[PDB]
Design a protein around this ligand. Structure first.
Ligand SMILES: Nc1nc2c(ncn2[C@@H]2O[C@H](COP(=O)(O)O[C@H]3[C@@H](O)[C@H](n4ccc(=O)[nH]c4=O)O[C@@H]3COP(=O)(O)O)[C@H]3OP(=O)(O)O[C@H]32)c(=O)[nH]1
Ligand SMILES: Nc1nc2c(ncn2[C@@H]2O[C@H](COP(=O)(O)O[C@H]3[C@@H](O)[C@H](n4ccc(=O)[nH]c4=O)O[C@@H]3COP(=O)(O)O)[C@H]3OP(=O)(O)O[C@H]32)c(=O)[nH]1
Ligand SMILES: *[C@@H]1O[C@H](CO)[C@@H](O[C@@H]2O[C@H](CO)[C@@H](O[C@@H]3O[C@H](CO)[C@@H](O)[C@H](O)[C@@H]3O)[C@H](O)[C@H]2NC(C)=O)[C@H](O)[C@H]1NC(C)=O
Ligand SMILES: *[C@@H]1O[C@H](CO)[C@@H](O[C@@H]2O[C@H](CO)[C@@H](O[C@@H]3O[C@H](CO)[C@@H](O)[C@H](O)[C@@H]3O)[C@H](O)[C@H]2NC(C)=O)[C@H](O)[C@H]1NC(C)=O
Ligand SMILES: *[C@@H]1O[C@H](CO)[C@@H](O[C@@H]2O[C@H](CO)[C@@H](O[C@@H]3O[C@H](CO)[C@@H](O)[C@H](O)[C@@H]3O)[C@H](O)[C@H]2NC(C)=O)[C@H](O)[C@H]1NC(C)=O
Ligand SMILES: *[C@@H]1O[C@H](CO)[C@@H](O[C@@H]2O[C@H](CO)[C@@H](O[C@@H]3O[C@H](CO)[C@@H](O)[C@H](O)[C@@H]3O)[C@H](O)[C@H]2NC(C)=O)[C@H](O)[C@H]1NC(C)=O
Ligand SMILES: *[C@@H]1O[C@H](CO)[C@@H](O[C@@H]2O[C@H](CO)[C@@H](O)[C@H](O)[C@H]2NC(C)=O)[C@H](O)[C@H]1NC(C)=O
Ligand SMILES: *[C@@H]1O[C@H](CO)[C@@H](O[C@@H]2O[C@H](CO)[C@@H](O)[C@H](O)[C@H]2NC(C)=O)[C@H](O)[C@H]1NC(C)=O
Ligand SMILES: O=c1ccn([C@@H]2O[C@H](CO)[C@@H](O)[C@H]2O)c(=O)[nH]1
Ligand SMILES: O=c1ccn([C@@H]2O[C@H](CO)[C@@H](O)[C@H]2O)c(=O)[nH]1
Ligand SMILES: *[C@@H]1O[C@H](CO)[C@@H](O)[C@H](O)[C@H]1NC(C)=O
Ligand SMILES: *[C@@H]1O[C@H](CO)[C@@H](O)[C@H](O)[C@H]1NC(C)=O
Ligand SMILES: *[C@@H]1O[C@H](CO)[C@@H](O)[C@H](O)[C@H]1NC(C)=O
Ligand SMILES: *[C@@H]1O[C@H](CO)[C@@H](O)[C@H](O)[C@H]1NC(C)=O
Ligand SMILES: *[C@@H]1O[C@H](CO)[C@@H](O)[C@H](O)[C@H]1NC(C)=O
Ligand SMILES: *[C@@H]1O[C@H](CO)[C@@H](O)[C@H](O)[C@H]1NC(C)=O
Ligand SMILES: *[C@@H]1O[C@H](CO)[C@@H](O)[C@H](O)[C@H]1NC(C)=O
Ligand SMILES: *[C@@H]1O[C@H](CO)[C@@H](O)[C@H](O)[C@H]1NC(C)=O
Ligand SMILES: *[C@@H]1O[C@H](CO)[C@@H](O)[C@H](O)[C@H]1NC(C)=O
Ligand SMILES: *[C@@H]1O[C@H](CO)[C@@H](O)[C@H](O)[C@H]1NC(C)=O
Lengths: 743, 737
């Protein structure tokens, strides 16, 4: 049984974030990939891996976690098959000397390396990917980056070079022509000469973002080119970049795009022009002629500060972008979207996504979207429609790359996102002349209206409706029923009226949906309903009821809600967490749908749980009771269940395991007992279980512990994670140490 | 040193201490004993034997999480006046309670039988509480009141019987009564005989008898066919001294004016939760109330009905003494000027409350034409551009409608929890001279520009919390020259977004601004001006923001973010995720500070030597962090520090000399840390140590010795200052060795 790492085959040794002080000498001979990131390793020497000649990869990132990792000349030199070596965030002062010449990936992102030397690098002929980003940047106290002449020239298999967020001042000379991707973002390069990318006939990606940056409102310390000038790109800079697919020129202070940049660039797929000053160019846009194969165009945050124009001015020459799939125009900042303003786009055959987030737009003429060929995502979030390093070095710096629309919503069809606006009620004609919308997000519009069964009549086929973070007033039982096809409904965070005991709350409308599969009512603080105390639906499969007040609903002095979930005949998944529950009336538990396969009651305050009532739940596979105050287990659990696969009891107050509880239920694969109060496990508990969790428990590590230890050896198919977290509370000398390490 | 209680001046506070039974170590000299919320299971004549000067006993909520009392167990207690036995699941009144009893509370038990044997022996009772013994869907018997049981109680002033099944006003009540409480007692009928003889009654509560049950937040049984309570027209005839009358939720559709004939001093009339819409618009009984100060007609809405207007009878103009009119939940669309006519000449009408009416429009000019409103309460409308506490009102909350700190300044207008998502140019035309304005929770997303409040320029307290304000203009709120308190908490919406502007410059422009709250805005980036500046400002709350990011190691722009706050005495930096504070950032905090909070962050280290630049610093709060050790040189860094809070850190060892370092140091909190000892080595008035894991061997004795030799050093919760080790000491307070 491996220690300290968790070893598997897919041979990986997961060994991260385990407070290891030195490289463990206890790693299998057979491991090919070792991860020791986020540990406290302070030294590496020609000893540190002596056992492990079959190592293809070592991750040593972020050591030591909260001064600097200390690597000896040739410490890795003995590792003949070492391919990928990650050394990020290790406060290195130089590139380690004597690296094995077999390397293909080297990463030194986020260290203190300001000298890139032949001695360090030139001998590594097999390097494919080399990452030196983020060594000198912002107001980090650091030197200008010295790149020794010809250091890269010998790297003739190098496909990816990244030097971003270093002070370079000039594109380094003598780059090998093997290069496919070249990242030089935020490098302080003012000027790009015809010579800089001369040879690079294989380049597919070039990133010159952040050189001559647009600094207004920068969320980082930002230094403009003198006068706020744009980057200066020679007319012929890109001449031989025939294979370029991706070009990032975000925040280079462009007022003018040169069309001839693109003359020899027939395969260009992505042009990123965020954070420039391109309002003028968006109105003119000759360069657009040059880009009929472009799929993605990001023109976000090019606004003129202070200027809030009536309309957006889009060149007719947008019509020429025949391959365009997505257009991003956040942050142009304009008051009104009129049908004609988007004419140049209405015939683009493959234009699927339009993103106008964050434009402070007050009005939109929605009939305009109809006229589009093929829109699948209309993203209008964040407008004014009405009735220890801050930046991840492995992320895009200029936007977020999460999907615009949850995938679960977009699978249903056309998507319209009106989240984070001011649509505080939906009027009669609000959704008029819209397309057949299937996925609709109205989250956080502070919508306080009484829905009544007509508001979505124009878009009756909505299948996924996100109404979270509003303040909806449920005083009408026809609400939403115009949506016969509704499958998913998200009503989380509409507490506003639910908190007020004296106003009606009608949730009757739920029964009227033929196809409703998932319903989210979390964080609504539900403690009182009007007239009908029961949730009913023949359809519903999942109910999420976390963060309401079942403590008040199932209070011992009130019977009204004793069956609140019973009418949910089709239910398999129920979540009752964060309901302040101290106990559940037996009658109320036995009234939970008998169809349940998955029940969560975690993060309440349960002192007692009545295990026997499980008998009314033949199909129950998973039971989550984490984060309650549970004191003991039943000793005959298999009397009460034959289905239970996963039982979670982390973070309770269990001090004893009953007689043979390990082998109590055959069906139990996964049992979680971590962060409880076990000081041992007697032979008593001995007499299909894949995983058993035990970390956090205060173990008494005397010879009383030997029974279980023996058990661990006799059942190595029972996985016990985090063995370094399965710790002796006592005795004094054994305190801190893993139970697994003492004789 | 008292144990296990904390004795004061002579009051033994001994509640919530996990006591299995009454402690036998109670100071013999104690008057009041609090043992509420322990796990006590039995009381005998043995329990309180040694204590004879007992005025009062509290044993509520025992055992907490079945209180057996023996007959006559309290008999030996010759001076016992007050006895609290709430929430003990008693099956009967206990027998043999002493005669000296002036106050008995038996709220929340299982007592269904009120007996002479229990009660009639208690000649001296002023106050008797028997409420909440059988109610709702509790399994309980109808309540038996033995005939005449209260007859002998001729000093009885308060009798509370609410929330029990009575069905009739028990007969034969001592005429001493000032206050009779009979809410939710299932009494359909009030006869002429029921009160007749109670000539000193100032208060009568008949609420919840024949309840209005629609949308009730509790299991609710109406009288047959929604019928009203039946009150005999001479039922209140000899109730000449009545000041408070509660008829909430009695299903009244009609009020008999003549109930108020002999009652010309009624001050409070509660008519919540009935059906008095017609009565409100006709209302002869409004003539019979010339001294009435507070009238509550809330929640008399007709369900479904949502009328254009509110119909207020002319006769409201006879309510000459009216100070506060509560008209929640009438439910209607539009408040016109003509509709509040009757109200305009009432000289003392200071408070008008229309919360929760779903109102869409108001003619704000109508409030001018009143004689002297101090409080216009319009929260929770549609304006645009055991569950229950047995010591609270059942039908409304009793907290001030407007926070006292805001009302203190003058006329107040509360428009919270509406949909005023921007303030238009006339939103505040025709208003009185408002001094306190609440616009919280309106989802207002506007760019304030220094003109929106011109029509009410003397606002001194402005609550704009829970909005989504867009700070894109340095002149925001600058028309309010008199502004003293500005609360902008919970306006994260746009501060989240790196790409839009965030202009806080406007703050320097106020001569008289004292308090600024910017909590929970997740502020991490600001536009152009990176500094907060004010000559006047005295307190800044900045909790719930991102100083971890503002003060990041690779950015210098915010290193002086608070320096320009030259007059500042209180600064809150809690909940900012700070793992460490740059030294140059700390030194840049205003030197005027007297109080600094940096609790609930994640600090591993603290540069104590930095305290030399803060010579007026009295309170330093570092609770809920990850500090691993204290300086050993504190005397050298500060001579001003009185309170030092380190609760909930990871401190393992107390530095030699620490306990006698500092002269200014009154109060030191080290509860919930990792102290195993306080070795001999290590103005002091209080020292908190509960929650630490002490080694309870002989090493500990030097500290015990220390405790004895300094009784002037309070150490609360000694019950909770527990041993972790060794195995035979685990569990035991460190005094009990
Ligand atoms: N460019 C951009 N993208 C944003 C923005 N806000 C959200 N996003 C989303 O990032 C996601 C990643 O976009 P990004 O353009 O940064 O990177 C793309 C594009 O550069 C590129 N791509 C993607 C699609 C395509 O048709 N052609 C193409 O070249 O492949 C990357 C991987 O993204 P994937 O599409 O596989 O998730 C997109 O998923 P999205 O359709 O929901 O809108 C995108 C934003 O402001 N700008
Ligand atoms: N009656 C009533 N009061 C409500 C309601 N909602 C909030 N409140 C507030 O609770 C508070 C308590 O009022 P309530 O009528 O329940 O009880 C009063 C009144 O019954 C009575 N009183 C108060 C003032 C007075 O002039 N005359 C008078 O008889 O003494 C009690 C204590 O008041 P306090 O000392 O807390 O101000 C008031 O302080 P408030 O001015 O903000 O408006 C009140 C509500 O819906 N109804
Ligand atoms: C400028 O524009 C280009 C957009 O083409 C950006 O390149 C993209 O950079 C991200 C972040 O490093 C890369 O994503 C990462 O990819 C690796 C490898 O597959 C994976 O380990 C990470 O988790 C993450 O997915 C992405 O590959 C890359 N795009 C392409 C086509 O290679 C560039 O980041 C932009 N520059 C800045 C500063 O925003
Ligand atoms: C309201 O509850 C719904 C339903 O539970 C939440 O949406 C669901 O969120 C879960 C994860 O939180 C999604 O499951 C995940 O699927 C992904 C991708 O396939 C998988 O990688 C994850 O391990 C996980 O299984 C689930 O698909 C999603 N369901 C739907 C229908 O969208 C929702 O987040 C809740 N709303 C709020 C505001 O919290
Ligand atoms: C019916 O209306 C009357 C209006 O007076 C309400 O009477 C009030 O009842 C509350 C609830 O206990 C009393 O509050 C208590 O005041 C005493 C003062 O010594 C204090 O010790 C308690 O902690 C508690 O705060 C309040 O005094 C009382 N008002 C008067 C003038 O006595 C009554 O509660 C209403 N009934 C229901 C069921 O809501
Ligand atoms: C925004 O910050 C202000 C200033 O901290 C908060 O208002 C202040 O709230 C405290 C209590 O948290 C008040 O002090 C308390 O006063 C009461 C009554 O005098 C007293 O009983 C307490 O012992 C304590 O002294 C303080 O007066 C009050 N300040 C003002 C100017 O009203 C405010 O609550 C914060 N807002 C939010 C939404 O968190
Ligand atoms: C509806 O719009 C809201 C608001 O933008 C989306 O909420 C975001 O969701 C992502 C992923 O769930 C989170 O990481 C963000 O934190 C959320 N933002 C906020 C402000 O809450 C929501 O996901 C959208 N719904 C769908 C179905 O796409
Ligand atoms: C402004 O309006 C809101 C209306 O809710 C008040 O916020 C409430 O404050 C009370 C008293 O502190 C709290 O107990 C409530 O929980 C708060 N409710 C909400 C929804 O936040 C606020 O106090 C009012 N401000 C002033 C100055 O009176
Ligand atoms: O927007 C509105 C308008 C009126 N009502 C009415 O107010 C009462 C209490 O909520 C109910 O009868 C309901 O009809 C609402 O709930 N919401
Ligand atoms: O409501 C608005 C309208 C426009 N802008 C403008 O948008 C840009 C980014 O915030 C800035 O120039 C600002 O003037 C806003 O910030 N908020
Ligand atoms: C790191 O360790 C090496 C030897 O292992 C030593 O020569 C060197 O001085 C150390 N450097 C630091 C800064 O610890
Ligand atoms: C673009 O849309 C056309 C139809 O207008 C379709 O034939 C073609 O397959 C689409 N192109 C891609 C790459 O999806
Ligand atoms: C629901 O609202 C509609 C629209 O006004 C109305 O016709 C209907 O009567 C309402 N139904 C209920 C349950 O009140
Ligand atoms: C909703 O379903 C119920 C049947 O349970 C029915 O009474 C009602 O008319 C339905 N309303 C709509 C709009 O489908
Ligand atoms: C029950 O749930 C299943 C999904 O597992 C679904 O196919 C079916 O429609 C549901 N039953 C009814 C009556 O809707
Ligand atoms: C109004 O209040 C004042 C001051 O408390 C009081 O003296 C006066 O009698 C009241 N006026 C009336 C008409 O009740
Ligand atoms: C703030 O907005 C007002 C109103 O639009 C305008 O007059 C003023 O110039 C603005 N001030 C700033 C700081 O831009
Ligand atoms: C606020 O004060 C600053 C300088 O202290 C000044 O620049 C600005 O014009 C002032 N604004 C207003 C609206 O008074
Ligand atoms: C500083 O605060 C104190 C107390 O509020 C006050 O006396 C003084 O006016 C303030 N100073 C200035 C310059 O506003
Ligand atoms: C504390 O700050 C002072 C002043 O900057 C500095 O001299 C000292 O080194 C700091 N000490 C620690 C513990 O960092």
């Amino acid at each position: 049984r491996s220690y300290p790492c968790d070893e598997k085959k897919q041979v990986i040794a997961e060994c991260s974030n385990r407070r290891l002080q030195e490289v463990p000498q206890t790693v299998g001979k057979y491991v090919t990939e070792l991860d020791l990131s986020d540990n406290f390793i302070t030294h590496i020497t020609n000893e540190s891996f002596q056992g492990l000649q079959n190592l293809t990869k070592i991750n040593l990132n972020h050591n030591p976690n909260v001064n600097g990792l200390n690597i000896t000349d040739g410490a890795f030199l003995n590792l003949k098959n070492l391919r990928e070596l990650l050394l990020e965030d290790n406060q290195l002062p130089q590139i380690p000397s004597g690296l094995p010449e077999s390397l293909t990936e080297l990463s030194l992102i986020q260290n203190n390396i300001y000298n890139i030397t032949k001695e360090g690098i030139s001998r590594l002929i097999n390097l494919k990917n080399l990452y030196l980003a983020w060594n000198c940047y912002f107001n980090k106290v650091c030197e200008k980056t010295n790149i020794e002449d010809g250091v890269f020239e010998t790297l003739t298999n190098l496909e990816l070079l990244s030097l971003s967020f270093n002070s370079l001042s000039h594109v380094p000379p003598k780059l090998p022509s093997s290069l496919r991707k070249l990242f030089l973002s935020n490098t302080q390069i003012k000027y790009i000469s015809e010579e800089d990318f001369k040879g690079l006939i294989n380049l597919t990606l070039l990133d010159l973002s952040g050189n001559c940056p647009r600094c207004f409102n920068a969320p980082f310390p930002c230094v403009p080119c003198d006068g706020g000038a744009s980057i200066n790109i020679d007319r012929f800079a890109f001449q031989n970049l025939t294979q370029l697919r991706y070009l990032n020129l975000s925040s280079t202070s462009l007022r003018k795009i040169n069309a001839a940049w693109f003359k020899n660039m027939p395969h260009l797929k992505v042009l990123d022009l965020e954070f420039n000053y391109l309002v003028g160019e968006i109105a003119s846009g000759a360069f657009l002629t040059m880009l009929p194969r472009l799929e993605i165009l990001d023109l976000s945050f090019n606004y003129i500060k202070g200027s809030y124009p009536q309309h957006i001015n889009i060149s007719r020459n947008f019509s020429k972008l025949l391959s365009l799939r997505a257009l991003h125009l956040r942050g142009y900042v304009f008051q009104e979207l009129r049908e004609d303003d988007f004419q140049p786009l209405m015939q683009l055959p493959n234009l699927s996504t339009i993103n106008l987030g964050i434009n402070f737009i007050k009005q939109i003429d929605f009939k305009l979207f109809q006229n589009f060929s093929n829109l699948e995502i209309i993203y209008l979030s964040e407008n004014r429609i009405s009735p220890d390093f801050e930046f991840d070095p492995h992320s895009n710096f200029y936007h977020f790359t999460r999907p615009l629309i949850k995938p679960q919503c977009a699978a249903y069809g056309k998507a319209l996102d009106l989240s984070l606006n001011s649509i505080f009620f939906i009027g009669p004609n609000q959704f008029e002349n819209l397309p057949d919308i299937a996925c609709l997000n109205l989250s956080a519009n502070s919508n306080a209206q009484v829905l009544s069964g007509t508001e979505f009549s124009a878009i009756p086929h909505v299948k996924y409706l996100d109404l979270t973070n509003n303040r909806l007033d449920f005083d009408n039982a026809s609400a939403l029923t115009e949506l016969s096809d509704l499958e998913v409904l998200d009503l989380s965070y509409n507490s506003h009226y639910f908190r007020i005991a004296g106003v009606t709350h009608h949730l009757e409308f739920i029964q009227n949906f033929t196809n409703l599969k998932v319903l989210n009512l979390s964080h609504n603080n539900i403690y009182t309903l009007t007239d009908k105390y029961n949730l009913e639906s023949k359809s519903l499969v999942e109910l999420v009821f976390s963060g309401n007040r079942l403590d008040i609903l199932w209070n011992d002095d009130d019977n009204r809600y004793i069956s609140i979930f019973k009418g949910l005949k089709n239910l398999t998944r129920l979540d009752l967490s964060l309901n302040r529950l101290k106990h559940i009336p037996n009658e109320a538990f036995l009234n939970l749908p008998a169809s349940l396969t998955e029940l969560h009651i975690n993060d309440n305050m349960l002192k007692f749980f009545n295990w026997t009532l499980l008998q009314q739940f033949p199909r129950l596979e998973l039971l989550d009771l984490r984060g309650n105050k549970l004191l003991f287990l039943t000793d005959s659990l298999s009397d009460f269940t034959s289905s239970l696969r996963t039982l979670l009891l982390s973070h309770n107050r269990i001090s004893h395991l009953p007689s043979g509880f390990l082998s109590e239920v055959s069906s139990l694969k996964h049992l979680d007992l971590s962060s409880n109060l076990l000081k041992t496990i007697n032979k008593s508990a001995l007499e299909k279980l894949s995983m058993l969790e035990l970390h956090g428990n205060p173990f008494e590590c005397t010879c009383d512990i030997g029974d279980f230890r023996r058990w661990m050896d006799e059942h190595l198919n029972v996985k016990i994670p985090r063995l370094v977290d399965v710790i002796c509370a006592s005795p004094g000398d054994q305190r801190g140490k893993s139970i697994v390490s003492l004789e």
